[PDB]
Symmetry: C3
Subunit: 483 residues, 3 copies
């Protein structure tokens, strides 16, 4: 009993809200608008600023995490590398945002040694997540070192919550992984953006549901319907098992698809233990006939035993048919909320409208500034002789630009462009190029103003780039929806 | 300052209550009704389900803790093994529930290396703690993997709070160890269950107080009386020291019983340091004349120095006579409360009444179902010819059992027993055995109904099994209550 | 979900206040009245009770931290040794309270191995911090082992907040380091204690501001004025850099003083990376021309590049000119408060008044007890014959002292001094010494009563001992206040 500091009412409330919000944000459930944890966001943005894209070969992950420590995220090195390892595995994570280089793990449960042993880089999907970031797309903030700037939320181009899910730590509130097939997800985005009232049955027509990174069988469409209506629910995960009867008589259970985030080795040891716990018999042996390649494993049922009985009993006991809860809890508008499939996609469509409007306004700013400078040079091309007469009558550059701005109503940018205009550009062979490019840039300004004026074309650009992503990446369901 | 999640009033209250209750339950003060921590409860129940009893030799503790991790308690492996080591030491813990096998520690303060170096099993007292568990005795719950079931509270057969105590971590609220002699405790339980108003002076007539695992001297019966009245108090722990005067002249302090959870080595180094801190003199030397066997240690006082002065001064300074607080704080009805010796034993007697009523109702269910089946076979033995006439007139087994249930008002269990009754059992040599066993089972049902009807016999069964435990285990006080 | 303990309203409030106050005190922001963390306070007091002063050579730090663990502070050994290492470095800490012995670290960022490899002791400033501690100066408390006593707040002799600063961990509330030059600080204390209303501009006349342990340049006197008025503010830290033009042409940036708690190696690697990040060019190379001795480092700017442009750009980008916040938050009266420079020094002057009054009352107690005993012996010297007549008429010592106290109105201390008075002291050659020493001790009592009666002399003693400290230690600013 050392500190005896008493008068701590509102200060314990403020410090408690601060430490709770720091838990919820930093080491807990991620955002709606990109589905990415802040550790993950700083991973992607730091590896963007290092430029470690798939044009270059893989770089040492220790340098990337050291730049994360020195710029964006001052926390555990092994925790940042844990996020690195979990992101860069095909079974741990559906679409590997980071493509790694070296031993990371196995489905049996394995870990890499440290951040200085293996390499990594961004995959083809992180370039999607970071395409059009540097263009006033999402507002930056100053981080803990007050010299670096980080993005608040990564400007996504595909809604990554439905793709990769949110694993959650409860300090009262935890959250789950509904994974999804990318192409059906994008089609669901299209149908929601077309009709503002689509029933969730008509999106279950679109979306089957859990597209696992290793495949499985999903039992229960009722729990699926409950989940994409209310947010809370549970489905059942039955492995892809089949009964194959030999001509000899000793039947066969071929198991090929253990469910989401379930060990192989622990389940097979649990099966052998349940043989030697002797509650039920009939299992002859287990053949684990692969080292790393191909997931198809034979467990034998003896002669004179219907293997569907053994199959139902291993589904009852083991981690081969489990429950799996859905609770789609994430940050919207700064608060954690349980949100539905409708609400996730409504918010994502609103965010892509924000992304498109900000990118379009940025390019209109850039082209408008260039057209402003080119208009100043065009006014210089209008009355060349008066400009030359003032330059010959000038004494300093400031006098020349001030008298040009006084005489032809010019800007500082315009007058600097005139006083830095090259004399070789004083020809009709150059006035043609300037005038044609000026009309082209005003045409581009009119096009971007038409984009900013009509929200239909906003949705059109969204549809086009989403279908581009769907062409570039969309596989189909490794998991079969059974009944 | 990363997460900026604002609207968190009731969610920070719910998450804060959740994390606080998870601290209080999991890593903090244990229960009234069995005195066992949830880590300890999962240790005992996992080692029960593995069957690692003293009929078998000791098994590797790593496998037990791995089964704890895979079934009941997903937390620190070294923390679970710390509970394993602390439970399985005679000086660290009064009655070793786990009997170990290998190097665990010393009273000097020593630790085992890991969970995969040494072995363990249950001792003779954990079989008491787990006797009659599988018989609807305490309701199970589903744990974090939703396939395993764990017990809420272990059905105790001796009140383990008073025996082993509760060490407590304060997040505002900590709790202490009153240990007790088992036989006097059981006699106190008997006298409380006999007279519902026994004064606490009359139970201090029964209970002396702290029965330490290594022995000591307890000063202060006033603090003892304060403790078993109100819960809060403190007693004084003076070591078993004696002054032995040599014929030569250089006197002797024989110290044999350091108090509860006090190091030997730190106290002897503190004594040598107090000699070389030179506040008071007269100590010649310290002889630590044992390696591991026998706790009797001689510290010499020189010629011309009364060793009672040195003895009072080492009691003033060192950790040889210390204070020791009592604050009997534990979970009753789901809340933590400071409870008295009366209240602990009233609650324990209520829990054993619950245990006895549930076990008696379970055995009445089992014998009643068997008597129901045997009554169906007895009705089959009544009119055998009509049953045979319907079986000969039957076409399917479902038809046969339906017509038997229609004709003689039978059950599905009764009709299956009749249609599976062996024809060799159709004799008067077999009707005698069935009728005699049927009357015996109805006699057992009448006996269990008499147990469920009269709470006197409930207390009688409690007295009998407690006195059985008292015969099987009760030693006496290694600690002397001095004045 | 293991513990299900519900009724926890006021108990979660009490446990939450307890764990929050334990964070704030133990592992967080330190006190006003000595500027020392409780870990640091237990370091200094434990090394005081071990007596490891600079009269003896350095002792092994593992023994000191082990005595800290065994007496005052039961927490992380590496955390206590982290406080040991940070305190005993000239660049990590302004005036090294602990003087160490061995490898501790570097400005590049280095750590010692453990507490058992290197040695330490108190420096010349910890003897100042612990001078007049054992004299009823600050009230002790009983610590966690109830046998040791520790000081609440160390009786400081120079205000250590302004000297060494308070680094803070936010659980909502963090705090910063304003370091100060000792001599100007003491002069500010003198001027505040003289005039109770000195304007903060007139103390910025006294106090320049941040006296860093390695030197720097401070930009912004406005933020300084904001800081010592309100507490919150920020100043800018520009390194001591200079542009030196070679006769060849390739200019030179000599950097000698990186700011407070900024790495060298990370900044030079950041500069080389910014060369290879290729945002701006002109830097030729970096020469790190020292191993450990002398901090003067040359970074080259190429021919035809004004190095003030490169200098402003490295100030914009790197950690060479940074921001630095001031938020003087510390414990006053048991609560954390943001306090101003006026308020820190008003509270420090009040604390030194408390120190002086308590020390003066202690020495008045000691001299008054000695004068009481000497007055009893003086009354014995008055009527020697009656005392001898009663001693000759006595039978026991208790009778003799009781009859002396009855006959001459004496005390137990006085009568024991008379009955233990040596007969050789019954001479006029000894009555002279007793009478002269008695008048001298009554003169000392009158002097201390004059100190306790007039607060002017209290401030005078404070001024004298502060100027003694200023003579013994005060260097000048390694940091230049630039504009």
């Amino acid at each position: 009993k050392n500190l005896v500091n008493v008068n701590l009412t509102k200060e314990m409330k403020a410090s408690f809200i601060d430490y709770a919000m720091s838990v919820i944000v930093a080491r807990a459930l991620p955002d709606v608008r990109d589905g990415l944890k802040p550790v993950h966001r700083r991973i992607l943005y730091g590896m963007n600023e290092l430029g470690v894209t798939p044009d270059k070969p893989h770089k040492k992950s220790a340098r990337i995490t050291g730049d994360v420590m020195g710029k964006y995220h001052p926390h555990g090195d092994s925790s940042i590398y844990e996020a690195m390892v979990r992101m860069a595995q095909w079974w741990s994570y559906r679409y590997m945002l980071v493509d790694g280089h070296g031993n990371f793990g196995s489905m049996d449960g394995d870990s890499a040694a440290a951040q200085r042993y293996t390499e990594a880089r961004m995959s083809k999907i992180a370039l999607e997540m970071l395409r059009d970031i540097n263009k006033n797309t999402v507002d930056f903030v100053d981080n803990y070192d007050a010299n670096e700037r980080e993005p608040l939320v990564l400007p996504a181009r595909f809604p990554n919550l439905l793709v990769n899910g949110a694993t959650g730590i409860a300090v009262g509130m935890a959250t789950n992984i509904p994974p999804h097939n990318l192409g059906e997800t994008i089609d669901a985005v299209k149908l929601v953006m077309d009709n503002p009232e689509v029933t969730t049955k008509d999106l279950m027509e679109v979306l089957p549901g859990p597209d696992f990174p290793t495949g499985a069988l999903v039992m229960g469409k009722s729990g699926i319907h409950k989940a994409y209506e209310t947010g809370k629910g549970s489905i059942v995960l039955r492995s892809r098992t089949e009964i194959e009867t030999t001509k000899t008589g000793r039947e066969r259970i071929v198991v090929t698809e253990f469910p989401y985030m379930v060990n192989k080795t622990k389940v097979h040891e649990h099966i052998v233990r349940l043989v030697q716990e002797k509650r039920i018999e009939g299992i002859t042996a287990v053949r684990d006939e692969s080292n790393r390649e191909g997931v198809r494993f034979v467990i034998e049922v003896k002669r004179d035993a219907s293997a569907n009985v053994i199959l139902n009993n291993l589904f009852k006991m083991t981690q081969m048919q489990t429950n799996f809860g859905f609770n789609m809890l994430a940050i919207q508008n700064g608060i954690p909320k349980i949100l539905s499939l409708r609400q996730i996609l409504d918010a994502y469509i609103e965010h892509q409208k924000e992304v498109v409007v900000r990118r379009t306004r940025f390019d209109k700013e850039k082209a408008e500034a260039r057209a402003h400078i080119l208009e100043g040079l065009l006014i210089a091309l209008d009355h060349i002789d008066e400009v030359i007469r003032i330059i010959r009558a000038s004494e300093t550059d400031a006098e020349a630009q001030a008298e040009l701005m006084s005489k032809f109503k010019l800007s500082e940018r315009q007058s600097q462009a005139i006083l830095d205009m090259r004399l070789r550009r004083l020809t009709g062979l150059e006035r043609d190029k300037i005038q044609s490019e000026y009309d082209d840039l005003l045409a581009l300004i009119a096009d971007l103003a038409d984009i900013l004026a009509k929200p239909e074309r906003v949705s059109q650009i969204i549809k086009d780039e989403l279908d581009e992503v769907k062409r570039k990446f969309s596989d189909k369901r490794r998991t079969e929806l059974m009944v």
